[PDB]
A paper describes a structure:
To investigate the structural basis for the altered substrate selectivity profile of [name]-[name], we crystallised this single cysteine mutant transporter in the presence of L-serine, L-cysteine and benzylcysteine. In the L-cysteine-bound [name]-[name] structure, the side chain of the cysteine at position 397 is pointing away from the substrate-binding site, which results in an increase in the size of the available pocket. Cysteine binds in a similar position to aspartate in wild-type [name] and HP2 is closed, but the space in the binding site created by the removal of Arg397 appears to be occupied by an extra non-protein density. We ruled out possibility that bound L-cysteine forms a disulphide bond with Cys397 as the thiols appear to be too far from each other and because similar extra density is observed in crystals of L-serine bound [name]-[name]. To investigate this, we examined L-[35S]cysteine uptake into liposomes containing [name]-[name] and observe similar levels of uptake of L-cysteine in the presence and absence of the reducing agent dithiothreitol. In contrast, there are no observed clashes between cysteine and closed HP2, supporting the finding that cysteine is a substrate of [name]-[name] as HP2 is required to close down over the binding site for translocation to occur. In [name]-[name], L-serine and L-cysteine binding is associated with an apparent number of coupled Na+ ions ~ 1.5–1.8, whereas binding of L-aspartate to the wild-type [name] appears to be coupled to ~ 2.9 Na+ ions. The decreased number of coupled ions in [name]-[name] is either due to the loss of a Na+-binding site or to the diminished cooperativity of binding. The latter possibility seems more likely because the geometry of all three Na+ sites is preserved, at least in cysteine-bound [name]-[name], and it is unlikely that some of these sites are unoccupied.
A prokaryotic cousin of the ASCTs and the EAATs, the aspartate transporter [name] from an archaeon [name], was first crystallised in 2004, revealing the structure of the SLC1 transporter family. [name] is a Na+-dependent transporter that is selective for aspartate. Like the EAATs and ASCTs, [name] is also coupled to the co-transport of three Na+ ions and contains an uncoupled anion conductance. It exists as a homotrimer with each protomer containing 8 transmembrane domains (TM1-8) and 2 hairpin loops (HP1, 2).
Numbering used by the authors:
A (entry chain B), B (entry chain C), C (entry chain A): 9 to 416
The structure:
């Protein structure tokens, strides 16, 4: 009964309110063991679909479109992601100079020391896109390796269509069809799961708001507005603009990508929302050849919301220390935060961890007694900021897919 | 050459005798490194099939039957399992008061202390039925998560059959067919494996009897009879009765579920026997829609033999301590042992571990110096008792599937 | 553009030269972080294919040929592998007495002590060929377990073809076709990957030669010639001979198995080359029923090049110690080195580790201060020797497959 897009908004609005209230009275623990579980069941159900829906769609997608086309689509969507994320940091910086988060704040040092996670070599990360066992990739998460194999297999099935043989052309057809069976079936699942969305959505915000809502005060409130205001400007000033320029009606784009944006925001998992954001890509009629490759790739490479969040935070820490950053250091943030964004995982609260990487680049390590005491303040309202960070991450992926879809 | 059902009985009877004899002369180690290996090869071969045969059968099964039907089947078979297991504990208690195992026994304390394995929250166990990656489920055991996904995919394929599109209805057909190919192929395997059954069966009892046969004396003999007598009464007084009531000839039910019962008994793995017990379900002509869902689920939820074993043992320990249990404590065993049974894994010697959980509930922890010295006595003949525990576990799953099958 | 077989030879010859030169000037580290990566990308791409290409080909292969035929093929190819490997050790010994590697050498003791890796029981290794979860096998490497399941499934699909039912015979067809789709697609991939071969090949030798080329002097040179000369005699004196005897033109056999031999040599992974060596088996028109089963099995069981390498080395260590081995000890090497060869993994530098196993059997453990200081000399030029060891390993697998193919 009832529309689904309506039910979510109710769950979201009524959820955010049931949370803030329960938590203000200290029931933050009662909400965690009682309400949250439902929000988790929603997440689990979505993660469930990611592997099959991604793999099966791309084999059909890579088999669908031209091998050179897919290659062009790739060069375009990568150019887009880089230019978006780079603009998102600079949009965050301009929000961190506009507002002043942690301007006249002095913090209690020594409270908590943080541990630096040593990053692996770029080379190793790149060669690890090519998986040594496809079955293993699928078996345990691993979206990007799967992306690689799927496209390869996709293109392989195509070349088996042109073969002179009858028995080869038939077996290739059969494989493709069954794989497409899975694909089609997976999108049908996302509908039924989207039915439990309102209940899940209610719970998910009920938890976040009860756990970190009441901490959104003082300088922590100012940084929160700084991020959200910026994010808002990323949508209006970057998406709504690039969409108009390319001849896509921005308003009916928001209408079609509503379920994706809200799942993203609530769930906090850029990757966990992927089956919803992939459906929404089918909804506005984009070709499987394009969205099937862009959305899963961008789900990891493209994070505007995260890049921006890292911008405003690198400025929060700097202001809390009392020393300002140079004209050239702000430009050194832009370039590092992009790299950090790309790096950030499609999972909740993964941007905050990556934030450290962009903190060394300016000149304020995370081991520094006081820096670490300021970074703990941010970490305390991180799930509040994360919801924003994720929504903008996802929007950017649809936007990019759309723009690249229209040009072809 | 020769019939298979005949060969097993020979292997079983001649195996049990070759074992008892070899072991009485201290060759318990000679049997383990020489004879057992063959019994293991039989187990490995059966485990081999479980994943494919379960998954592929349920996708076809869930796709076969009505979504509401499958749902009704579920409510019925769950009601059945609970009422069986609850009756099985009370049947065990009445066997533990009838016989008195460890009545006037005083044990050498301090011999061995046992370590309590802290259980996870019920919530966590329930949300973990919904897998976050189907490929992962399959990849590493995980029967229940697979059950969930398979049904979901099954129902998804069905809704793709009714689609207006031609290319969708065809791809959905193709997937289903191939998946069914696997299913059909897996049952054919179980035949060939059942051919090695006699050799395996011979070895498997040869080991159990040589390793723990000679320990079946004294108070350990009395508890052994107590369990077996009870188990026997579970079959005659609960299955043979509930089968007559529902209009199923009990005798030709035992005739058809012979291979399942014997594999179960010998193997000691409720789960490892699953491909045999699934074939036997096909043998008596039950629909894939029903047995495909009941048998794998009940293979973990339903354990009458284990529930009973836990009943008679909670009384063995209590009598060895010298203090009797209250009228209300016996009722507190019924309710805990059911929960423990459900909990017990479809693997050999897993009931004994769970026994601890039902031991705390009455008031005699497993850390208590002497309790633990009595529980070590039971553990010493556990594989003897386990064979019984498993057979009755499995019978109950077929029985339930049968009864639910007849009503529809 | 350009032929592929020509490009490789250029990469190989020009690669070996760019390596030796760069390394002689100490750029061994510059080659490792700059050039090698490309050689790795080539390896990754090949490993990628192994699982799918092996599995899918054998299901179709086992389904293709007679169950008794496949069984005969097995007995023949096993007899062949054993007799080859046994002849390869004796051919190495005769090379180690012909040349005298480490005759008058006295080494600096105490430099490096090595750690013995305790081997598992033969029984455990044999029962572990039968996998307890096929999906797991595939999921993580595990070629032999996959081999077992694939054949079983293959034979199962066949028996489903003869069924009286229509819906069974169709579903069995569908499965087989799709699985064959994968198979066919995988061979098409190996072509495209073989296109990157020259670049990879260039880099791969560029690294090996820069890293261990300059160490190929003195007594280390003499043992190197001893191995290579022997290997050469294994090809001419064992393959070219057994091929003529069975009516196969040796020269156009080398022409067809060129890509396999060179990938093998460069890559150093007997297993990593398997998709190339499997294609080359298709190239000379052998049946999927035969090569699909022989090549992956022999890829682990059959290692002539490794067996020989172990022969000449067991003599190098013995001569460096100063005590000669008995007539009967040389015969005790033959029998142990075969077992060690079979044991050696289809991965780079795995023969050297196994060498230890055949070192205990004569009477000179690897823990012995000085033995271990001599074994470290060998380990230093091991990748040089490994390239030879691998090529001959692979050749032997094609040879055997060919000979068994002709007899049928
Ligand atoms: Na994203
Ligand atoms: Na990212
Ligand atoms: Na059971
Ligand atoms: Na259980
Ligand atoms: Na080999
Ligand atoms: Na080997």
């Amino acid at each position: 009964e009832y529309p689904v897009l309506q039910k979510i908004l109710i769950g979201l609005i009524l959820g955010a309110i049931v949370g803030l209230i329960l938590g203000h009275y200290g029931y933050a623990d009662a909400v965690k063991t009682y309400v949250k579980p439902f929000g988790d069941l929603f997440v689990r159900l979505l993660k469930m679909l990611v592997m099959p829906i991604v793999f099966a769609s791309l084999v059909v997608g890579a088999a669908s479109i031209s091998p050179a086309r897919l290659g062009r689509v790739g060069v375009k969507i990568v150019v887009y992601y880089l230019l978006t994320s780079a603009f998102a940091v600079t949009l965050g910086i301009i929000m961190a100079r506009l507002f002043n988060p942690g301007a006249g704040i002095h913090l209690a040092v020594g409270g908590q020391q943080f541990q630096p996670k040593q990053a692996p070599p770029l080379v190793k990360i790149l060669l690890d896109i090519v998986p040594t066992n496809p079955f293993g990739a699928l078996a345990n998460g691993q979206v990007l390796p799967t992306i690689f194999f799927a496209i390869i297999l996709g293109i392989a099935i195509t070349y088996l269509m042109n073969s002179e043989n009858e028995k080869v052309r038939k077996s290739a057809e059969t494989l493709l069809d069954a794989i497409n069976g899975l694909a089609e079936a997976m999108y049908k699942i996302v509908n039924g799961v989207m039915q439990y969305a309102p209940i899940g959505v209610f719970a998910l915000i009920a938890y976040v708001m009860a756990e970190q809502g009441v901490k959104v005060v003082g300088e922590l409130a100012k940084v929160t507005a700084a991020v959200y205001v910026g994010l808002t400007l990323q949508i209006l000033l970057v998406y709504f603009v690039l969409l108009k320029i390319y001849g896509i009606d921005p308003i009916s784009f928001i209408k079609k990508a509503k379920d994706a944006m809200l799942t993203a925001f609530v769930t906090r998992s850029s990757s966990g929302t992927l089956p919803v954001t992939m459906r929404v890509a089918k909804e506005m009629g984009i070709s499987e050849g394009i969205y099937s490759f862009t959305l899963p790739l961008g789900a990891t490479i493209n994070m505007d919301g995260t890049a921006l969040y890292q911008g405003v935070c690198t400025f929060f820490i700097a202001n809390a220390l009392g020393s300002h950053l140079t004209v050239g250091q702000q430009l050194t943030i832009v370039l590092t935060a992009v790299l950090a964004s790309i790096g950030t995982a499609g999972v909740p609260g993964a941007g905050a961890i990556m934030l450290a990487m962009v903190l060394e680049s300016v000149g304020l390590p995370l081991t520094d007694p006081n820096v670490a005491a300021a970074y703990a303040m941010i970490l305390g309202i991180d799930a509040i900021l994360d919801m924003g960070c994720t929504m903008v991450n996802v929007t950017g992926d649809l936007t990019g897919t759309a723009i690249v879809a229209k040009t072809e």
